[PDB]
């Protein structure tokens, strides 16, 4: 997250870190046994880390749970990033508490202009590199579909939306992949793609979670 703020420990209790020897992606806890992340975060050997603030220090509220199964969306296209969503099943249920909590799925899609909370442990620089150890947050509005399409001509599908700031300076960035975009208390987006970070006229592009609720529900009812 570039141009954001330190969330505060465990104030985003649905945020997970995906770990394969190192943090490589975020995700969102949707119930005690499942995480939603980006399909472009898929790899084997994932450990889910819940209750994190500082990802390099054991602070006392963590739960580390290996993944048993990952399910990439059936129509995921890694070239276009259309349908950039995946479910990850935990090998054992998380213990839900004040610091480890699920985020609700949407029942309606969010509106342009709504302010959302984007979070992650990604780079905090638009040029150069610095990784925070503690969770960073950004408040960002959903952009109109016409601004989004004008920013990324030929590339925005109905399964995507833009959020952020056209003037740049405030955005998600490398390492935030797969993490939440929460609007009105519901998981509405997943950190998906963009051109650079915090560049002018190049906001973040997020997977439109509301279009996937029926797939998520059916998938978790059978796995
Ligand atoms: B991801 C990843 C981070 C950030 C985006 C948004 S870019 C922007 N302009 N808002 C995307 C995708 O990619 C790498 O795989 C990583 O681990 O983070
Ligand atoms: Ca920790």
Curated annotation (Swiss-Prot):
Disulfide bonds: 7-137, 25-41, 109-210, 116-183, 148-162, 173-197
Superkingdom in the source lineage: Eukaryota
SMART domains membership: Tryp_SPc (SM00020)
GO-annotated molecular function: endopeptidase activity; metal ion binding; serine-type endopeptidase activity; serpin family protein binding
Activity control: Is inhibited by scorpion cyclotide trypsin inhibitor TopI1.
Binding-site residues, substrate: 171-172, 174-175, 177
Catalysis: reaction(s): Preferential cleavage: Arg-|-Xaa, Lys-|-Xaa
Keywords for this protein: Calcium, Digestion, Disulfide bond, Hydrolase, Metal-binding, Protease, Secreted, Serine protease, Signal, Zymogen
Cellular component aspect of the GO annotation: extracellular space; serine protease inhibitor complex
InterPro entries for the chain: Peptidase_S1_PA, Peptidase_S1_PA_chymotrypsin, Peptidase_S1A, Serine_Proteases_S1, Trypsin_dom, TRYPSIN_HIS, TRYPSIN_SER
Entry EC no(s): 3.4.21.4
Domain Peptidase S1 as annotated: residue spans: 1-221
Chain residues that bind Ca(2+): 52, 54, 57, 62
Tissue: Synthesized in the acinar cells of the pancreas.
Obligatory cofactor(s): Ca(2+)
Cofactor remark from the record: Binds 1 Ca(2+) ion per subunit.
Post-translational modification: Subsequent cleavage after Lys-125 leads to alpha-trypsin. Further cleavage after Lys-170 yields pseudotrypsin. A cleavage may also occur after Arg-99.
Chief location: secreted
UniProt GO BP: digestion; proteolysis
Active site: 40 (charge relay system), 84 (charge relay system), 177 (charge relay system)
Description of how the protein assembles with itself and partners: Interacts with SERPINA1.
Family stated for the protein in its record: Belongs to the peptidase S1 family.
PANTHER family in UniProt: RIKEN CDNA 2210010C04 GENE, TRYPSIN-RELATED
Listed name of the protein: Serine protease 1
């Amino acid at each position: 997250i570039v141009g954001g703020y330190t969330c505060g420990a465990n104030t985003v209790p649905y945020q997970v870190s995906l770990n394969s020897g190192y943090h490589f992606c975020g995700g969102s806890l949707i119930n005690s046994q499942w995480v939603v992340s980006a399909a472009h975060c898929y790899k084997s050997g994932i450990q889910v880390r819940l209750g994190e603030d500082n990802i390099n220090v054991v602070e006392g509220n963590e739960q580390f749970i290996s993944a048993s199964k990952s399910i990439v969306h059936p129509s995921y296209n890694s070239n276009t990033l259309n349908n950039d969503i995946m479910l990850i099943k935990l090998k054992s249920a998380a213990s839900l508490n004040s610091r480890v909590a699920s985020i609700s799925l949407p029942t309606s899609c969010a509106s342009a202009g709504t302010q959302c909370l984007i979070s992650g442990w990604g780079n905090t620089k638009s040029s150069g590199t610095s990784y925070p150890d503690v969770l960073k947050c950004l408040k960002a509005p959903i952009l109109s579909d016409s601004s989004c399409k004008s920013a990324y001509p030929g590339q925005i599908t109905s399964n995507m939306f833009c959020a952020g700031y056209l003037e740049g300076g405030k955005d998600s960035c490398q390492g935030d992949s797969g993490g939440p975009v929460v609007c009105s208390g519901k998981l509405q987006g997943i950190v998906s793609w963009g051109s650079g970070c915090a560049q002018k006229n190049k906001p973040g592009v997020y997977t439109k979670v509301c279009n996937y609720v029926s797939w998520i529900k059916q998938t978790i009812a059978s796995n």
